[PDB]
Amino acid sequence: HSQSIFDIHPVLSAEEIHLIEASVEQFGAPLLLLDCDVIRQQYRALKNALPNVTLHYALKPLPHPVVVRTLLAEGASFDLATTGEVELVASEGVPADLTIHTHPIKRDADIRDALAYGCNVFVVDNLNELEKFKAYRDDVELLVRLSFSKKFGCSPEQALVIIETAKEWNIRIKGLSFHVGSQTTNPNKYVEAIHTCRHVMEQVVERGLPALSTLDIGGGFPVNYTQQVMPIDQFCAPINEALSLLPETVHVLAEPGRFICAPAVTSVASVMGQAEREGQIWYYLDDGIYGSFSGLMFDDARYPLTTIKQGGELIPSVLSGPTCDSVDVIAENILLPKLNNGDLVIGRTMGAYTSATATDFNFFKRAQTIALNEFV
Amino acid sequence: VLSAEEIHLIEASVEQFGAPLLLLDCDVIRQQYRALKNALPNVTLHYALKPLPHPVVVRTLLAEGASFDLATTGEVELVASEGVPADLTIHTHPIKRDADIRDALAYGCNVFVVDNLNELEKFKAYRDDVELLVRLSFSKKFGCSPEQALVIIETAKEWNIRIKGLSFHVGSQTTNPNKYVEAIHTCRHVMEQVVERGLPALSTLDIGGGFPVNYTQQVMPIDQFCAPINEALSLLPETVHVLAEPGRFICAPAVTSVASVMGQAEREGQIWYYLDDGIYGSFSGLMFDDARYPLTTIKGELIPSVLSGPTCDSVDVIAENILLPKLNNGDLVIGRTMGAYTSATATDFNFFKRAQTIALNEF
Ligand SMILES: *[C@@H](NCCCCN)c1c(COP(=O)(O)O)cnc(C)c1O
Ligand SMILES: *[C@@H](NCCCCN)c1c(COP(=O)(O)O)cnc(C)c1O
Numbered sequence: 001h002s003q004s005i006f007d008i009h010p011v012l013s014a015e016e017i018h019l020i021e022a023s024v025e026q027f028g029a030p031l032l033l034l035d036c037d038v039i040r041q042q043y044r045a046l047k048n049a050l051p052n053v054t055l056h057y058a059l060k061p062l063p064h065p066v067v068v069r070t071l072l073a074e075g076a077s078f079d080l081a082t083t084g085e086v087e088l089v090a091s092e093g094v095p096a097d098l099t100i101h102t103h104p105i106k107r108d109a110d111i112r113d114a115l116a117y118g119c120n121v122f123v124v125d126n127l128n129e130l131e132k133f134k135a136y137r138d139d140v141e142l143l144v145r146l147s148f149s150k151k152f153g154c155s156p157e158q159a160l161v162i163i164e165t166a167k168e169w170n171i172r173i174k175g176l177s178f179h180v181g182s183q184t185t186n187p188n189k190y191v192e193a194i195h196t197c198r199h200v201m202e203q204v205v206e207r208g209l210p211a212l213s214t215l216d217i218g219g220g221f222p223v224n225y226t227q228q229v230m231p232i233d234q235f236c237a238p239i240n241e242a243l244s245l246l247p248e249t250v251h252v253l254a255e256p257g258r259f260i261c262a263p264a265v266t267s268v269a270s271v272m273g274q275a276e277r278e279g280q281i282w283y284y285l286d287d288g289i290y291g292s293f294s295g296l297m298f299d300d301a302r303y304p305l306t307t308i309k310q311g312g313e314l315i316p317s318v319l320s321g322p323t324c325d326s327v328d329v330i331a332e333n334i335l336l337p338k339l340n341n342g343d344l345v346i347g348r349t350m351g352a353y354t355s356a357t358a359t360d361f362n363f364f365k366r367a368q369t370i371a372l373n374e375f376v
Numbered sequence: 377v378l379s380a381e382e383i384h385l386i387e388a389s390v391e392q393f394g395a396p397l398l399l400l401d402c403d404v405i406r407q408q409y410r411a412l413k414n415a416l417p418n419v420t421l422h423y424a425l426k427p428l429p430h431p432v433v434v435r436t437l438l439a440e441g442a443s444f445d446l447a448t449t450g451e452v453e454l455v456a457s458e459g460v461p462a463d464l465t466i467h468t469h470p471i472k473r474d475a476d477i478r479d480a481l482a483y484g485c486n487v488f489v490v491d492n493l494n495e496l497e498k499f500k501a502y503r504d505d506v507e508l509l510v511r512l513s514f515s516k517k518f519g520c521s522p523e524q525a526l527v528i529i530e531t532a533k534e535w536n537i538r539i540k541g542l543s544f545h546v547g548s549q550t551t552n553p554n555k556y557v558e559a560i561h562t563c564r565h566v567m568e569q570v571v572e573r574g575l576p577a578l579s580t581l582d583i584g585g586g587f588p589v590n591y592t593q594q595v596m597p598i599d600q601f602c603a604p605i606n607e608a609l610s611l612l613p614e615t616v617h618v619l620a621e622p623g624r625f626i627c628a629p630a631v632t633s634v635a636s637v638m639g640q641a642e643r644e645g646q647i648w649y650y651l652d653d654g655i656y657g658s659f660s661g662l663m664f665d666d667a668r669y670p671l672t673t674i675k676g677e678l679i680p681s682v683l684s685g686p687t688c689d690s691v692d693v694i695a696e697n698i699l700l701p702k703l704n705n706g707d708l709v710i711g712r713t714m715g716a717y718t719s720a721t722a723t724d725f726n727f728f729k730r731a732q733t734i735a736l737n738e739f
């Protein structure tokens with residue numbers, strides 16, 4: 001569902017419109033336009049906002065080989081959750097030492113597959129999981145994931161029990177991790193977590209256990225959809241302050257996903273047909289909630305939407321997806337100029353938890369991703 | 377409950393193929409088809425591929441004498457690849473690109489649906505080749521008003537486009553057959569108005585899908601469900617041929633899901649089990665189909681538990697509160713009535729493998 005252009009030969013600009021129209025002319029709709037310049041911009045902005053933190057890109061929101069290559073070249077590390085993600089980074093020549101595996105609940109095979117690639121950092125949040133590493137004790141170092149509806153992470157008290165048990169079992173503990181949740185708009189969540197982890201690290205030392213080397217602050221850095229979020233520097237300011245209280249012997253990781261990929265993709269769908277229903281014009285698009293807009297369902301999402309056509313009468317409209325399902329609706333009420341069949345509907349901030357969560361329902365073709373600007 | 381033989385079959389399948397699995401019983405496909413045929417005498421049944429577009433289901437139904445209801449080029453390619461003659465098919469997507477029409481025609485499917493004049497116009501170029509069903513609604517996304525149906529039928533005559541008849545779809549998992557009856561009465565009246573306007577008489581009524589199945593609560597037996605429907609159809613002229621587009625009724629009961637426990641943890645007074653299938657996989661119907669499936673274990677000291685899917689996402693939970701016996705890693709969680717709008721709406725999120733479908737009793 002993807003190809004690259006390596007040789008090109010609120011309101012959209014004339015240049016953007018031209019690119020969009022040329023792309024539909026060349027490749028046909030629906031499309032996802034991936035701009036590698038934005039991947040780099042986002043990575044650089046986060047690096048500048050969170051100095052002295054190793055950024056492990058979480059493949060989950062957009063596990064795209066071009067994104068992986070772009071980030072590798074930029075100096076990024078990676079956060080893997082499955083054998084499939086291990087295989088993707090392996091195929092793109094990512095050195096295993098740049099990777100961590102963070103799925104807290106793993107089958108024996110999942111551990112073996114990652115180890116075979118060379119990824120040797122894993123996460124545990126319970127004793128049942130810890131036991132799985134006895135057979136691998138020479139080979140691994142573990143992050144213990146804390147939580148403070150949450151599905152993963154143990155309590156601070158449980159974390160100490162896990163760490164003490166790992167010592168008994170001769171299993172190395174690399175450090176602690178947490179994930180405050182995706183699209184977190186309040187940085188105080190990070191601050192409170194960091195303080196708690198710091199206190200846990202102190203308790204480990206006071207108990208005479210090996211001192212922890214690493215804090216992994218997870219993902220969740222927010223981006224703008226239809227509402228303004230805190231600028232990344234301002235967002236990370238209190239985070240940086242909390243981190244500064246850690247011992248100098250602790251180094252810090254994060255697992256950003258959405259922040260890096262979300263702004264980098266623009267969706268393009270076309271109108272297949274249309275009908276007036278109870279005073280609204282319904283447009284039936286070639287992409288929807290079983291496709292690139294699946295984030296409306298799984299990610300509680302809302303994306304800015306626009307049209308190339310602008311000006312004249314704005315009409316109460318409905319944007320429907322292509323499937324036969326009445327649930328497949330992208331915008332229940334939206335003002336739009338009158339569109340003809342074949343006219344384009346554009347979605348912004350379409351990079352994260354979109355195509356990643358697409359289906360093949362009805363066998364409608366998935367949007368094709370077009371990768372731009374990888375080199376230079 | 378699971379029978380001793382069901383348990384043996386499930387365990388044997390996991391022994392051979394691993395987990396997660398979807399066990400597809402072709403005998404149940406046959407049974408459901410035969411039961412609906414008996415319940416709705418003289419109605420031609422077009423299986424909707426959408427809920428479960430599996431090659432073995434298509435072959436099984438073809439052999440049974442079934443017809444087919446297609447929505448997309450992909451579905452056209454599926455029945456074609458399984459050798460289904462085009463005359464057993466109808467294409468029912470109301471909103472089509474020119475290519476969608478051409479692809480269906482290439483295969484030989486010549487029956488299409490329209491619910492508006494914009495769509496009707498797409499068929500001028502194919503007037504020699506097509507006959508159309510006009511879809512009424514009485515709900516939200518498709519179907520014109522009875523008054524609009526008349527405008528469409530009249531301008532089709534003007535444009536020299538053939539109208540096969542009328543269609544409707546009252547909605548999936550319709551538990552009250554009285555919605556069909558009201559639909560049928562309204563269509564009967566539209567048919568009368570066509571004749572009274574001096575237009576060509578309509579040959580066909582398509583009553584759509586929506587026949588319900590038992591999930592966690594029982595629904596009315598199919599014979600009883602359809603009794604009032606047959607009564608309503610009996611008031612039609614004897615010359616009208618009746619079609620239906622059952623999906624869920626045929627496929628839903630034919631599949632049993634099998635997942636295994638990858639790991640587990642106590643989280644505030646509940647044991648969480650993390651399965652190898654979930655809301656991004658076979659249980660995607662929890663999201664898209666507003667579904668709830670009966671869930672059981674192979675195994676009496678029922679303890680408060682949560683069933684989570686495999687993905688990292690906190691949304692990926694199958695059951696928030698369920699009483700289960702204590703399970704060990706590797707133990708199985710079994711879902712019933714897992715045939716329809718399940719695997720069909722699976723994703724590849726996190727690159728977790730989709731459950732493998734195992735066809736049983738194919739021959
Ligand atoms: C992502 N977790 C699931 C997000 C599901 C969205 N519908 C996750 C990330 C990346 O989160 P992000 O908000 O920066 O994209 C990082 N680390 C862990 C452990 C995650 O689960
Ligand atoms: C199915 N329509 C969408 C169902 C989405 C469920 N989440 C459909 C059918 C088959 O319906 P069923 O209830 O018998 O499976 C038949 N005909 C049409 C036109 C449909 O859209």
Ligand SMILES: [Mg+2]
Binds near residue numbers: 097121
């Ligand atoms: Mg290392």
